[model samples]
Target: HHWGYGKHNGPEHWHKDFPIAKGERQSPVDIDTHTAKYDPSLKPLSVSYDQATSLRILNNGHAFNVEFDDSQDKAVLKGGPLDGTYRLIQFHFHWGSLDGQGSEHTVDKKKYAAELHLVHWNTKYGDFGKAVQQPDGLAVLGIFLKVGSAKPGLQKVVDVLDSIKTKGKSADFTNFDPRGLLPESLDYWTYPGSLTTPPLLECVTWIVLKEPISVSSEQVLKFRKLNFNGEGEPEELMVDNWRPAQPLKNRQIKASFK
Candidate 1:
C-alpha cells in the first residue's frame, strides 16, 4: 500500500517507491532562523473559517486528521506567500512519543513536542486531487506544539480519540473552530517545499508560524494511545509520526519579521 513512519517503510525508505523523496524541495526542512532572509514583500496571512465546515476525525494509519468540507471557499487562507485563495481541506498532527523532539519544521534546529499541518488547496485548481500536481497548488500552515498549559480547542480533538483508536476508524466531529488553536502572531517563515509524507509532491508553499500553541503533557500522551494497526491486527501504537528535517538545497527560507 502506502508508505508509513516505521523503521522499514519510513522516510528514508520512501525514495524506493516515490522518487521525489530526494527532490531539491523536500519538506520538513529545519528553519535556520539566522540564515532566513527577512522578506518585506510577504504580507500578513489571513484565515477565515466557517465553524460548520468541520466534518469528521479519522485515523489514516499515518496520523489523525480532522477533515473539513472544502466544496466551496467557506474556510480559506490568503496573503502571506500566496497569490490566490486556498481553501481549508483538513488539519493533522505529527508528534513524538515523548517531549523535546517531534516537530517536523524545527526553529534554529530546535524541535518542539509536536507540529500541526493545516492543509489547503488552491481554488484556481479544480479540487485537492487536481491541485497537488501543480507547483503552487497547495498552502500548508505549519504550527508548532510545545508542552505547557492545555489548549482548550485541542482538548475537544483529543477527547474523541477514544472512539477512533485504530486505523480507519472515524467519528463525526462537527462545528469545531480551528482558530483557537493558532498563536496570536501571524508572523511566519515561508518557502517552497514538498509534502512531508510519501508521494512527497512538491506542490506546497509552506507557511510555518513563529509562535507555538501549548498542549499539556497528558494530552500528548493520549495521542500515543491510538493504534497504527487495524482492529484485527496486533496493536502498534502510533507515535513518532514525524519526518526528520531534510536538506534545504538551494532554496531560501523567508521570514515575515526581522
Candidate 2:
C-alpha cells in the first residue's frame, strides 16, 4: 500500500500496514510542558553547518528536502542528550495548507503552523541506512515555525521552489547555511521517539526546541504551491505534510529548562 497524507493512505490508515505505528516509542508525541521534568545534565546542543555541504533541494513526493554532503563531518550536531557526533544528512519541512496546523509535535496540545527537521545520523553507525536499526542511531533537531513576521533565512529556500515544483524534480541549492534558521534560544525537550513517517523505525533521539521561528503567511503559501505529484501525474498541492501526534506511552520527555 502506498503511504501518504491522503484519505486512503493517511496516518490513520498507516497502522494497518506498519504495525509499529502503534509501538510504544512512536514520535511526534504531544509534550505536556508542565510534566516535562527539567534535567540539568542535558547539555546545550552544539551545531556547526558548513554552507558548502548543502548539495541540492528536491521534492521527494512527501516533502521537499535539502540534502547535504555527509561523507565527512562538514556539518554536524552533537551534545544535548548525545554522547557522540552525528553528521548532518538532510533537512526538510512539514507544513499545513492552512495556518493553525501542520506541525507533527505539539506543546501542551498546541500545534504550530509548521515544523522543520534537521536530520543527523550517528557517525558510529557508518551510514544512515544501517543507523536506522540502532537505538541511538539518529538525532533529529526539530524547530517549530509560527505565523508572524517574515523570516529572511527561510525565504532563500522559498525562492527556489519554482525550480522543483513537482515530485522528483531537483535543483542546485548550494551555499545555504541552515544554522541561521534556528531560534535565538536553544532550550529544548528531548525524548526517545521513532520517525514520524515510515519505516516507522524506533531509532530517533528527538530534540525539539522550545522557541519557534517566524514565517509570514505569504511564505507558507509558497510551500503549499509545491506539488506532491510528478509532472505526468494528476497534480496535487503538497500541503499538510505532517503526522498527527502519537501517544507517549512509557516514555519520559525531558526538558532542558525548568
Candidate 3:
C-alpha cells in the first residue's frame, strides 16, 4: 500500500516499507564544498551534437521521460575521449510542490528550486538498468534550475506539460531535441555514485554540470500544477514532491579539473 504522509513518503521511510531499501543510495545530499582533495583520473570528454539522435517521449504519470536513440554515438564511446561510450537512454526531472525549492541534489546545503537527471548507460558494459549494478556502468548528467528568466530550452518541454498534466497521461513528443536543454559549457564535476532512488546500487558515474538553467516563477508554478496522483479523478495538486537529503557514505566526488 502507498503510505501517504510526509514522513511515510519521504526517503527515510523507504527502508522501513521495503527492507531492501536500506541498501539503496538516495541522492540530493549536500556537497561538501570545503573538501579540497578529489580524484582527477577521468578526463572530461566533449559530447558532439547531431540531428540524427532519435528522441522519444514517454508519459509516465510522475513525469515525462524523454529518451534518445544514440546508436550512432556508440563508436564514439568505444575509443573517443570519454574512455567509454554511454548510450543515451532517457532524461527526466524532479521538483517540489512549492516554487521556492524541491530537488534531490543540493549545493552547500542549499537546495535549488528543482533538478533534472539525464540518464545514460555505458555501451562498453550494457543497458541503463543493468549498468546501474556496475561501479562504472551508468552515467547521469545533472542540471540545476533556479527561479529567474524563462529558459527557451525548457519551453519545449513546458509547452507540452499541459498535455501530460494528469498521471499516466502521455503522448508522442516529436521533433524535440534534448541537446537544446544542455548548457553552452561542458565543464562538470564527476563522481562515483548510485541512483538517488532505491536499490541505490553504488554504480553511477555522475556528471553534474556547473552551469544552471533558469525558469520563471510562472514556469515553476506550472510544474506544481501537475498531480502525482493517478489520472482522471479530481486533480490532487502536488505541492512539494521531493525527498530529503541522503547520506554521502564513503563515496568520493571528483571534479573534471583539480
Candidate 4:
C-alpha cells in the first residue's frame, strides 16, 4: 500500500500490489485483554536510548520519521519478548481522518487518535536490512496517542512540520531522545507481527505500550499539514496513514503487567 489509507490505495486493495499484505503475522491487531495471557515471568522492559544518538527527522511522504544513528550500540531495547539487544533506528507515527480514529491497534476494538512506532533492529543479525528478513530481527515499540494537554516533547517535533510540509523534505533534528515521547510506564503487550507497510516483511516482534502519551488537539493535527506529494504533484494531506488490524491467528499476545 503505497501512500496507503483511504479507499483507493488503502489496505483493502494492497494485496494486489504486495502479496504479503495478508501475511500470517500481520500487524496492528486489536488487543483483546480478556484473552491476552498474563506472563508473570516477562521481565520489565529495558530501554537505553540516549539523546545524542538522534540524527535527523524527515518527511518521506508516508509519515514523519526521526532517524537515528544505529552505527553504534548506544541506543538499545531489550527484555520483554526479545532474544538480545535491539538498536533504535527510526521512529514515526500514524493517524486517522480525525483525532479519535487513527491508531492501528485497537483495545476492545476501539482505537485512539494516533499511534507511534519506535523501530529497532536486533544486533545479532548485525545489519538492519538483514535483520528485517528474519523473525525476531526487529522489535517495534508502539505507543498510542490521546487528545489532552499539549506534550512538550511533541511540540518540538510539531514546530518543524511547516518546514517539511512536502515529501522528501528534512531538517536537522538532533539532541532529542525519543524516550521523552513515551509514557511513564514501560509496561507493554508483545506479539510477533509484520511491517504494516509495503514490503510487509514478517519479521517484527511488536511491543506496544499499554499506557499512552498525551498531545493537544493543535499538536496532533499539525501533522495534517504535511503534503504527501514531493513537489509538482497533487497536494494531499497526510492523514489516516495506518493499517487496519490483522488476524491474530494462533499468535500469543503477552502482557508484561497484569
Q: How accurate locally, in lDDT, is each candidate?
A: 0.93, 0.93, 0.66, 0.88
lDDT rank order: 2, 1, 4, 3
**What digit string (tens of lDDT, one per residue) describes model 4 on residues 16-113?**
88888877889879999999999998998889876337878899879999988999888899888787899999999998779779999999898999
Clashing pairs in 2: none
Q: Ten residues in a row with the worst lDDT in model 4?
A: 1-10
Q: Tell me the tens digit of each residue's lDDT in model 1 across 58-149.
A: 99898999999998878999999899999999999999988988899998889999999999999999899989999999999999999999
Measured with C-alpha atoms, the lDDT of residue 5 in candidate 3 is 25
TM-score of 2: 0.98
Instruction: List model 3 lDDT by residue over 1-258, tens digit each.
Output: 453325546566766665644444445566666662454555555554454354556555555577667555621222222466776677888887665677777777778888888777787665566677677777778888888898886787777777777767766766666677777776666655667665556677777777788889888888777676677676666555566666667655555554
Better of 3 and 4 by lDDT: 4
**Pick by lDDT: 2 or 3, better one:** 2
